[PDB]
């Protein structure tokens, strides 16, 4: 009732998913029959750069690499539900992959929003079902021109506006380390698939952490570039024309060198000609390969989200190993974080009170992983305001987010956009006054229980700050939760004692052994330097 | 009710008078010490050769500086283009970094380029007596490149105009003809450079403000992609408007000068001073290419009827390019009326003009602004009523009026997305024809004083490229003949509304004035845009190279 259309969409989506997996399995079995000899485990454990080298040299055939990864992806999907669709014609793309491409023969996984000709990009939304893309988005075209073979679409939380990973069409994606845990999101299918060995390279998008959450939660590396470093042309989205806080797309992979190779392959004449709106900045190898001592700003906490004990240890140990390696570590925290999060980020993301975003959910189910976000956004402006006034004395954080999610005039949007611009210049000035090269920060972890990110909005603080600032930011795994880390979490209080702090403690319970990351940041357009820094952390923390 | 604005104007005029007297003193002192200096020779050297002689030591920075200062003072007498002498610039002179790419080059600045210790009034009382406390980023970079910024030049009040008068410093006049506008809003730059009083200047452009004064005054100007150069520290009058991006860029006597200025600005100094600007070095090889181009072109945008001189300029340039072996392909960006009336107008005035109007509270409104302020002040419901009445007879006026109404953030998002889609749509057309560059008419010849504010429609040629955010430059290619001028009597405009009527009259009596064409390339392709401009300059006015 009011859900007949949504129910029919889910029924067809599930049958498409099921038929996709069956097709993959058929293809894999056929291949294995003809190739009983192939050492599949050796092939799967090769770091991407080595895989690429052997594909370029002919030591490994693209078919062997393709079907071996296809088989692994099908297998790890069993326990994770990360795959929504097999990009069918990728078998033919395989046979015609450009031979001198930088990614020749490399199977690549795609977050579902990367439009692929002939396939839906549903984003888990009933209204996007049965609407196959007319063509590949630009970054998909460039991947193919560089010889890569995009082979699957991976799951996202409904609408993508979430750091969990469930929707009413394909269901819930689970963390491959612990099935009761979220894989993070919104690029959570990617995180789960790459984190379990089913893909050597993937693409995600990030507006509040959506590349970094799943990378950290699933123990892999991820980079969110400056928003306009790579082309978003052709991507499927759910809000259009919101430019205060820009969406960014970037790579996810098992190591830092893979992220660098992916960026190098994307930043080519092909991309710059297909999307003239992206500045034609080539990948600067000399910056990325540099090995000079860095001035590293760092903070153990943002005073907003109290770090978990494992987060704090991860940060301090990384700081200490960097110092031992000759880098200079400088205490540094961007000024006015609560304003950046509550006023600028929230205000920019929801300038219209959520009406545009809400159009997506009309007649649809609302996935439990979204929590009360939809119900809150639907509230009348006067009531959001009233409710905010009431909450303010007891729970200022909740009050602040709520008041800043109201609709406003174009006049007020200009003012907010100007404040965003000035805040960016403020942090840049602060940075330059300490002469920083890069910035090391905590990263949210370990993974939260399924269906809890929707109830812990405050915890986007570590990531969304750099969307607001539009600085490149990436994450690197550096440790795993210990018994002691996990025991200490039982004393966690947070700085506010509101529902978000309380949920986080419970949602992080039972995490021994899960991966924990740190975040590496550089200035706008300095992706190469940001990756150089990530590489240094990777060398020191996972030797 | 105006004592405030009257006091402001009195102080501003005194400050300008004192600046000019300071210049006169400095110039005379220098001349007495250098009676043998061949100033005409020095003033007529193309900037490239001027730069070379400064770099080798053949000319001293003092000789170049004081000779240009003198010329600037002299041409100011008939144009009123200089508002302020940037006083500490003589000390910058003696400290200019010796290896800088602009070592010893005097540079003029549009008044909005913040310079420590000086107002950037924009012709507005509310900004008078509030001196900047830091050089803006592009000014810091010029200085780091050894250039010597030396004057602030006049703008129309608020800058939101293609004429050039304000109540503080008064009206700037075209150096070719004192009854004509020098264009704007970078009009002081146009008049100063166009009359030989500066070898290089910086302007800004949101609807044509670099390109109009370049064209009206017969010089070269380039409006890059909006974020190619740093706007950090500029003085503005509307903040946070990002649908139609402001751009800053160089103005000069020849194309090579624009290229040199861009090359000097696009350096590590700028990219470290403003990390928000993508660090794209000037690609010398693209600028210097001699390969044949595929050149899209149009002789009319079907929105503003071109003057007979504009049309002739365009067709002659087209034919010389064809003769030089380039491929000329007819091309017109789709949906121009929609891009101007809905996207550009709605983008510039999304809030009904409220933020803009705050600047005028308690101020005189310069006559060159026409009825703009009066119209913007009208109640949204009345703009809507008047639009409906006007629609049947005067669709164009009705449309502008309807799209200057205030709206929600929700509607602004929708508009921003339509802008993004429109950009991609024109890009797709361009790609489908495999264009390298695009040749278009440029508004000219110069309009009579006080008429640009009453001919808003004529921004069509230039504003389209702020909407699209493509680099666009102008190059002088001919002058109005008596034949071209007599033909204005047959000019009707496509609409016959007040804007066409004003334009017809405003473009008459222009014999001998310069006429330009406009050169366009894709976003971030300034070097290719400049390569095409250099080709046009060479073919139409070979003696400039
Ligand atoms: C992720 O970056 C989203 C991660 C969760 C952010 C939640 C922030 C929040 C702030 C204030 C109140 C509640 C929550 C990601 N990937 C894609 C997107 C996204 C979001 C909106 C629109 C689009 C789009 O149109 O493509 N993408 O977020
Ligand atoms: C010039 O580009 C202005 C050229 C005239 C454009 C008139 C377009 C128009 C008028 C009326 C109705 C519809 C369209 C220029 N230089 C600077 C600026 C400018 C304008 C506004 C704000 C700012 C700023 O804040 O720096 N600059 O316009
Ligand atoms: Cl940009
Ligand atoms: Na008018």
Coordinates of C-alpha atoms in Angstrom, one line a residue, chain A residues 240-531:
Chain A
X240 CA 21.8 17.9 -7.9
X241 CA 23.3 21.4 -7.9
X242 CA 24.4 21.4 -4.3
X243 CA 28.0 22.8 -4.7
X244 CA 28.8 24.2 -1.2
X245 CA 30.2 20.8 -0.2
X246 CA 31.4 19.0 -3.3
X247 CA 31.4 15.3 -4.0
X248 CA 34.7 13.7 -4.6
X249 CA 35.6 10.3 -6.3
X250 CA 38.7 8.3 -5.8
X251 CA 40.4 4.9 -5.5
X252 CA 40.3 2.1 -2.9
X253 CA 42.8 -0.7 -2.9
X254 CA 44.9 -3.0 -0.8
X255 CA 48.0 -0.7 -0.7
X256 CA 49.1 2.9 -1.3
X257 CA 51.0 2.2 -4.5
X258 CA 47.7 0.9 -6.1
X259 CA 46.0 4.2 -5.3
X260 CA 48.9 6.1 -6.9
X261 CA 48.8 3.9 -10.0
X262 CA 45.0 4.3 -10.3
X263 CA 45.3 8.1 -10.1
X264 CA 48.2 8.2 -12.6
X265 CA 46.1 6.2 -15.1
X266 CA 43.0 8.3 -14.6
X267 CA 44.8 11.6 -14.9
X268 CA 45.6 11.3 -18.6
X269 CA 44.6 13.2 -21.8
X270 CA 41.7 10.8 -22.3
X271 CA 40.0 12.1 -19.0
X272 CA 40.9 15.7 -19.7
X273 CA 39.4 15.6 -23.1
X274 CA 36.3 13.7 -22.2
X275 CA 35.7 16.2 -19.3
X276 CA 37.2 19.6 -20.1
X277 CA 35.8 20.9 -16.8
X278 CA 38.4 19.1 -14.8
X279 CA 41.8 20.9 -14.5
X280 CA 44.3 19.0 -16.7
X281 CA 46.8 18.4 -13.8
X282 CA 48.9 15.3 -14.6
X283 CA 50.0 13.0 -11.8
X284 CA 53.3 14.5 -10.5
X285 CA 55.5 11.5 -10.0
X286 CA 58.4 13.4 -8.6
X287 CA 56.3 14.7 -5.7
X288 CA 54.8 11.3 -5.0
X289 CA 58.2 9.5 -5.1
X290 CA 59.9 12.2 -2.9
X291 CA 61.5 10.9 0.3
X292 CA 62.3 14.2 2.1
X293 CA 61.5 14.7 5.8
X294 CA 58.0 16.1 6.4
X295 CA 56.6 18.6 8.8
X296 CA 53.5 16.7 10.0
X297 CA 50.8 18.4 12.0
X298 CA 48.8 15.9 14.2
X299 CA 46.0 15.7 16.6
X300 CA 44.9 12.8 18.8
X301 CA 41.3 14.0 19.1
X302 CA 39.2 16.6 17.4
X303 CA 37.4 17.4 20.7
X304 CA 34.2 16.5 19.0
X305 CA 34.1 12.7 18.7
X306 CA 36.2 11.2 21.5
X307 CA 38.5 8.7 19.8
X308 CA 38.1 5.1 20.7
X309 CA 41.1 3.8 22.7
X310 CA 42.2 1.9 19.6
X311 CA 41.9 5.0 17.4
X312 CA 44.0 7.0 19.9
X313 CA 46.7 4.3 20.2
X314 CA 46.8 4.0 16.4
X315 CA 47.4 7.8 16.0
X316 CA 50.0 8.0 18.8
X317 CA 52.0 5.0 17.6
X318 CA 52.0 6.4 14.0
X319 CA 53.2 9.8 15.4
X320 CA 56.0 8.0 17.3
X321 CA 57.2 6.0 14.3
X322 CA 57.1 9.1 12.1
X323 CA 59.3 10.9 14.6
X324 CA 61.7 8.0 14.9
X325 CA 62.0 8.2 11.1
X326 CA 63.1 11.8 11.1
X327 CA 59.9 13.6 10.5
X328 CA 58.9 16.6 12.6
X329 CA 55.5 16.2 14.4
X330 CA 53.7 19.4 15.2
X331 CA 50.6 19.6 17.4
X332 CA 47.8 21.1 15.2
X333 CA 44.0 21.2 15.2
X334 CA 42.0 23.1 12.6
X335 CA 40.1 26.0 14.3
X336 CA 36.4 26.0 14.8
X337 CA 35.6 22.4 14.0
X338 CA 32.1 22.5 15.6
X339 CA 31.2 25.4 13.2
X340 CA 32.7 23.5 10.2
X341 CA 30.6 20.5 11.0
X342 CA 27.3 21.9 12.4
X343 CA 26.9 25.1 10.4
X344 CA 29.0 24.8 7.2
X345 CA 28.9 21.1 6.4
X346 CA 25.4 20.3 7.6
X347 CA 24.1 23.6 6.3
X348 CA 25.7 23.0 2.9
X349 CA 24.5 19.5 2.6
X350 CA 20.9 20.4 3.6
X351 CA 20.5 24.1 2.5
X352 CA 17.0 23.3 1.2
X353 CA 15.9 21.5 4.4
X354 CA 16.4 18.1 2.6
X355 CA 13.5 18.6 0.1
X356 CA 15.5 17.7 -3.0
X357 CA 17.0 14.7 -1.2
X358 CA 13.6 13.6 0.0
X359 CA 12.2 13.5 -3.5
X360 CA 14.2 10.3 -3.9
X361 CA 12.2 8.5 -1.1
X362 CA 8.6 9.3 -2.2
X363 CA 6.7 6.0 -2.3
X364 CA 9.8 4.1 -1.2
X365 CA 10.7 2.1 1.9
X366 CA 13.3 3.7 4.1
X367 CA 16.1 1.2 5.0
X368 CA 16.6 0.8 8.7
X369 CA 20.3 1.7 8.3
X370 CA 19.3 5.3 7.6
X371 CA 17.9 5.6 11.1
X372 CA 15.6 8.7 11.7
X373 CA 17.2 10.8 9.0
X374 CA 14.3 10.7 6.6
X375 CA 11.7 11.3 9.4
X376 CA 13.8 14.3 10.7
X377 CA 14.2 15.9 7.3
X378 CA 10.5 15.7 6.6
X379 CA 9.7 17.8 9.7
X380 CA 8.4 21.3 8.9
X381 CA 11.0 24.1 9.3
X382 CA 9.2 25.7 12.2
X383 CA 9.1 22.4 14.1
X384 CA 12.8 21.7 13.4
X385 CA 13.4 25.1 14.9
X386 CA 11.2 24.6 17.9
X387 CA 12.6 21.2 18.6
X388 CA 16.1 22.6 18.3
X389 CA 15.4 25.3 20.9
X390 CA 14.1 22.7 23.4
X391 CA 17.0 20.3 22.9
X392 CA 19.7 23.0 23.1
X393 CA 20.1 23.3 26.9
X394 CA 20.5 19.5 27.4
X395 CA 21.9 18.3 24.0
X396 CA 23.6 21.3 22.2
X397 CA 25.1 19.0 19.5
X398 CA 21.8 17.5 18.4
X399 CA 20.2 21.0 18.6
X400 CA 22.8 22.4 16.4
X401 CA 22.6 19.8 13.6
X402 CA 18.8 20.1 13.7
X403 CA 18.7 23.9 13.4
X404 CA 21.1 23.8 10.5
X405 CA 19.1 21.3 8.5
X406 CA 16.3 23.8 7.8
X407 CA 15.4 25.3 4.4
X408 CA 16.7 28.8 3.5
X409 CA 16.7 31.5 0.9
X410 CA 19.2 31.8 -1.9
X411 CA 20.4 35.0 -0.2
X412 CA 21.3 32.9 2.9
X413 CA 22.9 30.2 0.7
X414 CA 25.3 32.8 -0.8
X415 CA 26.2 33.9 2.7
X416 CA 26.9 30.3 3.7
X417 CA 29.0 29.6 0.6
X418 CA 31.0 32.7 1.3
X419 CA 31.6 31.5 4.9
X420 CA 32.7 28.1 3.5
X421 CA 35.2 29.9 1.3
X422 CA 36.5 32.0 4.1
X423 CA 36.8 29.1 6.5
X424 CA 38.9 27.3 3.9
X425 CA 41.2 30.2 3.7
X426 CA 41.3 30.4 7.5
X427 CA 42.5 26.8 7.9
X428 CA 45.0 27.2 5.0
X429 CA 46.4 30.3 6.8
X430 CA 46.6 28.4 10.1
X431 CA 48.4 25.5 8.3
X432 CA 50.9 27.8 6.6
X433 CA 51.6 29.7 9.9
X434 CA 53.0 26.3 11.3
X435 CA 54.6 25.6 8.0
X436 CA 53.0 22.2 7.7
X437 CA 53.6 19.8 4.8
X438 CA 50.8 17.4 5.8
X439 CA 48.4 16.5 8.6
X440 CA 47.9 13.3 10.5
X441 CA 44.6 12.7 12.2
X442 CA 42.6 9.9 13.9
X443 CA 40.2 7.9 11.6
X444 CA 36.9 6.4 12.9
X445 CA 37.2 2.8 13.9
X446 CA 36.9 0.0 14.6
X447 CA 33.8 -0.9 12.6
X448 CA 30.4 -0.2 14.1
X449 CA 27.7 -2.8 14.4
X450 CA 25.3 -3.0 11.5
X451 CA 22.5 -0.4 11.5
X452 CA 24.3 1.9 14.0
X453 CA 26.1 4.4 11.8
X454 CA 22.6 5.9 11.1
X455 CA 22.4 6.5 14.9
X456 CA 25.9 8.0 15.4
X457 CA 25.9 11.0 13.1
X458 CA 28.4 12.9 15.3
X459 CA 31.1 10.4 14.4
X460 CA 31.5 11.8 10.9
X461 CA 33.5 14.5 12.5
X462 CA 37.0 13.2 11.6
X463 CA 36.1 12.8 7.9
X464 CA 33.5 15.4 7.0
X465 CA 35.8 18.2 8.1
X466 CA 37.9 17.6 5.0
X467 CA 34.9 17.5 2.6
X468 CA 34.0 20.9 4.0
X469 CA 37.6 22.1 3.5
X470 CA 37.9 20.2 0.3
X471 CA 41.4 18.9 1.1
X472 CA 42.7 15.6 -0.2
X473 CA 42.4 13.0 2.6
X474 CA 43.2 9.3 2.6
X475 CA 43.3 6.4 5.1
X476 CA 45.9 3.7 5.8
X477 CA 45.4 0.6 8.1
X478 CA 48.0 0.7 10.9
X479 CA 46.9 -1.6 13.7
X480 CA 44.1 -4.0 14.9
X481 CA 42.0 -3.8 18.1
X482 CA 43.6 -5.5 21.1
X483 CA 42.0 -7.0 24.2
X484 CA 43.1 -4.0 26.1
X485 CA 41.8 -1.5 23.5
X486 CA 38.5 -3.3 23.6
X487 CA 38.3 -3.4 27.4
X488 CA 39.1 0.3 27.6
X489 CA 36.2 1.1 25.2
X490 CA 33.9 -0.1 28.0
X491 CA 34.7 3.1 29.9
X492 CA 34.1 5.4 26.9
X493 CA 32.1 8.5 27.7
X494 CA 32.4 10.8 24.7
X495 CA 32.5 14.6 25.1
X496 CA 28.7 15.2 25.1
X497 CA 27.0 12.2 26.7
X498 CA 24.2 12.5 24.1
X499 CA 22.6 9.6 22.2
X500 CA 25.4 9.6 19.6
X501 CA 28.2 9.1 22.2
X502 CA 26.1 6.4 23.9
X503 CA 25.4 4.5 20.7
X504 CA 29.1 4.6 19.7
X505 CA 30.2 2.8 22.8
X506 CA 27.7 0.0 22.3
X507 CA 28.2 -0.1 18.5
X508 CA 32.0 -0.6 18.9
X509 CA 31.6 -3.4 21.5
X510 CA 33.2 -6.8 20.6
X511 CA 35.9 -5.5 18.2
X512 CA 39.0 -7.4 19.1
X513 CA 41.1 -8.1 16.0
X514 CA 39.3 -5.5 13.7
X515 CA 41.5 -3.1 11.6
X516 CA 42.0 0.5 12.7
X517 CA 43.3 3.3 10.5
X518 CA 44.7 6.8 10.6
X519 CA 43.9 9.7 8.2
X520 CA 46.5 11.6 6.1
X521 CA 45.7 15.1 4.7
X522 CA 47.4 17.6 2.4
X523 CA 46.4 20.9 0.9
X524 CA 44.0 21.3 -2.1
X525 CA 45.4 19.7 -5.3
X526 CA 48.2 18.0 -3.4
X527 CA 47.1 14.4 -3.9
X528 CA 50.6 13.3 -4.8
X529 CA 52.0 14.6 -1.5
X530 CA 49.1 13.1 0.4
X531 CA 49.9 9.7 -1.2

